[PDB]
Design an enzyme around this catalytic site. Structure first.
Site, PDB file in Angstrom:
ATOM      1  N   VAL A  36       0.806  -1.207   0.000  1.00  0.00           N
ATOM      2  CA  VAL A  36       0.000   0.000   0.000  1.00  0.00           C
ATOM      3  C   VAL A  36       0.845   1.264   0.000  1.00  0.00           C
ATOM      4  CG1 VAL A  36      -2.084   0.928   0.958  1.00  0.00           C
ATOM      5  CG2 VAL A  36      -1.267  -1.318   1.665  1.00  0.00           C
ATOM      6  N   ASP A 147     -12.024 -12.103   6.781  1.00  0.00           N
ATOM      7  CA  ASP A 147     -10.842 -11.446   7.328  1.00  0.00           C
ATOM      8  C   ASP A 147     -11.160 -10.127   8.032  1.00  0.00           C
ATOM      9  OD1 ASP A 147      -8.114  -9.854   7.097  1.00  0.00           O
ATOM     10  OD2 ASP A 147      -7.659 -11.957   6.706  1.00  0.00           O
TER      11      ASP A 147
HETATM   12  C1  LIG Z   1       0.977  -6.149  11.597  1.00  0.00           C
HETATM   13  S1  LIG Z   1      -0.695  -5.814  10.912  1.00  0.00           S
HETATM   14  O1  LIG Z   1      -0.950  -4.421  11.239  1.00  0.00           O
HETATM   15  O2  LIG Z   1      -1.554  -6.855  11.524  1.00  0.00           O
HETATM   16  N1  LIG Z   1      -0.633  -5.991   9.183  1.00  0.00           N
HETATM   17  C2  LIG Z   1      -1.530  -5.195   8.412  1.00  0.00           C
HETATM   18  C3  LIG Z   1      -2.922  -5.668   8.206  1.00  0.00           C
HETATM   19  C4  LIG Z   1      -3.871  -4.891   7.421  1.00  0.00           C
HETATM   20  C5  LIG Z   1      -3.494  -3.589   6.790  1.00  0.00           C
HETATM   21  C6  LIG Z   1      -4.540  -2.770   5.946  1.00  0.00           C
HETATM   22  C7  LIG Z   1      -4.637  -3.064   4.426  1.00  0.00           C
HETATM   23  N2  LIG Z   1      -4.408  -1.803   3.706  1.00  0.00           N
HETATM   24  C8  LIG Z   1      -5.275  -1.363   2.638  1.00  0.00           C
HETATM   25  O3  LIG Z   1      -5.827  -2.121   1.816  1.00  0.00           O
HETATM   26  C9  LIG Z   1      -5.546   0.098   2.475  1.00  0.00           C
HETATM   27  C10 LIG Z   1      -6.421   0.512   1.395  1.00  0.00           C
HETATM   28  C11 LIG Z   1      -6.759   1.889   1.139  1.00  0.00           C
HETATM   29  C12 LIG Z   1      -6.239   2.958   1.958  1.00  0.00           C
HETATM   30  O4  LIG Z   1      -6.707   4.162   1.512  1.00  0.00           O
HETATM   31  C13 LIG Z   1      -5.352   2.631   3.062  1.00  0.00           C
HETATM   32  N3  LIG Z   1      -4.643   3.311   4.072  1.00  0.00           N
HETATM   33  C14 LIG Z   1      -3.946   2.350   4.849  1.00  0.00           C
HETATM   34  C15 LIG Z   1      -3.127   2.665   5.952  1.00  0.00           C
HETATM   35  C16 LIG Z   1      -3.417   3.870   6.803  1.00  0.00           C
HETATM   36  C17 LIG Z   1      -2.633   4.242   7.926  1.00  0.00           C
HETATM   37  C18 LIG Z   1      -1.466   3.437   8.315  1.00  0.00           C
HETATM   38 CL1  LIG Z   1      -0.535   3.911   9.678  1.00  0.00          CL
HETATM   39  C19 LIG Z   1      -1.091   2.251   7.570  1.00  0.00           C
HETATM   40  C20 LIG Z   1      -1.861   1.847   6.428  1.00  0.00           C
HETATM   41 CL2  LIG Z   1      -1.283   0.402   5.643  1.00  0.00          CL
HETATM   42  N4  LIG Z   1      -4.198   1.073   4.353  1.00  0.00           N
HETATM   43  C21 LIG Z   1      -5.014   1.174   3.310  1.00  0.00           C
HETATM   44  C22 LIG Z   1      -2.075  -3.113   7.006  1.00  0.00           C
HETATM   45  C23 LIG Z   1      -1.112  -3.893   7.796  1.00  0.00           C
END
Ligand SMILES: CS(=O)(=O)Nc1ccc(CCNC(=O)c2ccc(O)c3nc(-c4ccc(Cl)cc4Cl)[nH]c23)cc1
Length: 350
Positions: A36, A147
């Protein structure tokens, strides 16, 4: 700032590619599934999130498909989608251009979590209700997230508007076909799922949503455990020992069994001394062993716990008014229309 210009296909219109270019490209997430990114669209100047993923090539990408059908105001939108690459045998990379949302129930939970405090019930309602409503949506189309976890529950702070994301492990459950097994997550997988089911319904998402509501009410996962079997060892210690009557309904060929014959300690004592009566009950009718015994997303929305949202004076902690919480469409009401006399309060329209 390299203005990256690509050929994209509107995940919304039909299939007619048009040149779209972006910039500011910055990674913001990397791991288990996806890379992402985050960027500004050279036109609208808007914010977006590119979800880079491996494109199967010899088969059709399921995420992209399930994503193109959807179009619910509480499910991250699919603006455009385009392809990228690397090298070697030339594995193709699918790029999903989506609506950029900030925080999440995960990052939000991990925050009050290290402040020995908890998400104020009013927020819990707004987040949960909005989640259950998105569930009500996809499910009406037979699609199962498989999920639903705090991590994929995106949420815009200044709006209290939660959008469901990551439809990667999501598939369309069709009846009369055994689904193997692999899916969901660690703390948010369902009992039947741990008993290695295969004829399991969308009710599994309800169980994952069930946990999330329980976690937000405790400041820590309710059914920890790093080991599947070990996990159940914990689920039972909360909900109680699952009878053959239940294990049967769960489906399993578990003609045999032998687990912790523990006598449960009432939901009135699992949750902190302050948890309000209904948020506990809603949880009870959510976290049950019998798949066909749990609330349906639609019914969940209409659980007494969310009445405050159906009150004419729902004051949003942020200041401005609460999200469009009643524009239920005929599709979401599909599972049981009558509940419109509850979901859409006397003062609603549009
Ligand atoms: C160790 S964990 O946290 O369990 N792993 C993990 C599980 C699930 C996800 C979400 C999937 N992401 C999207 O599809 C996704 C899609 C559209 C977005 O506009 C968007 N914005 C984020 C995001 C925001 C703030 C922060 Cl600090 C981090 C992220 Cl990634 N993810 C997304 C990210 C990491």
């Amino acid at each position: 700032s390299k203005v990256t210009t690509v050929v994209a296909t509107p995940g919304q219109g039909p299939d007619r590619p048009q040149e779209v270019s972006y910039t500011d490209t910055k990674v913001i997430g990397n791991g288990s599934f996806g890379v992402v990114y985050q960027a500004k669209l050279c036109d609208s100047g808007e914010l977006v999130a590119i979800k880079k993923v491996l494109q199967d090539k010899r088969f059709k990408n399921r995420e992209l498909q399930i994503m193109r059908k959807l179009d619910h105001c509480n499910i991250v939108r699919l603006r455009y989608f385009f392809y990228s690459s690397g090298e070697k045998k030339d594995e193709v990379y699918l790029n999903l251009v989506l609506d950029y949302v900030p925080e999440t129930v995960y990052r939000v939970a991990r925050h009050y979590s290290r402040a020995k405090q908890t998400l104020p019930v009013i927020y819990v309602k707004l987040y949960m209700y909005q989640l259950f409503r998105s569930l009500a949506y996809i499910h009406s189309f037979g699609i199962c997230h498989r999920d639903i976890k705090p991590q994929n529950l995106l949420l815009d702070p200044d709006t209290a508007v939660l959008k469901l994301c990551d439809f990667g492990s999501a598939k369309q459950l069709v009846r009369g076909e055994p689904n193997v097994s692999y899916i969901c997550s660690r703390y948010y997988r369902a009992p039947e799922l741990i008993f290695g089911a295969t004829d399991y319904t969308s009710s599994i998402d309800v169980w994952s949503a069930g946990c999330v509501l329980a976690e937000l009410l405790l400041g820590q996962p309710i059914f920890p455990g790093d080991s599947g079997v070990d996990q159940l060892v914990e689920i039972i210690k909360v909900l109680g020992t699952p009878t053959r009557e239940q294990i049967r309904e769960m489906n399993p060929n578990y003609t045999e069994f032998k687990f912790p014959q523990i006598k449960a300690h009432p939901w009135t004592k699992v949750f902190r001394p302050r948890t309000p009566p209904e948020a506990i009950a809603l949880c009870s009718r959510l976290l049950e062993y019998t798949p066909t015994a749990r609330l349906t997303p639609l019914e969940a929305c209409a659980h007494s716990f969310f009445d405050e949202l159906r009150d004419p004076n729902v004051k949003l902690p942020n200041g401005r008014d609460t999200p469009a919480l009643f524009n239920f469409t005929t599709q979401e009401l599909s599972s049981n229309p009558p509940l419109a006399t509850i979901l859409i309060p006397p003062h609603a329209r549009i």
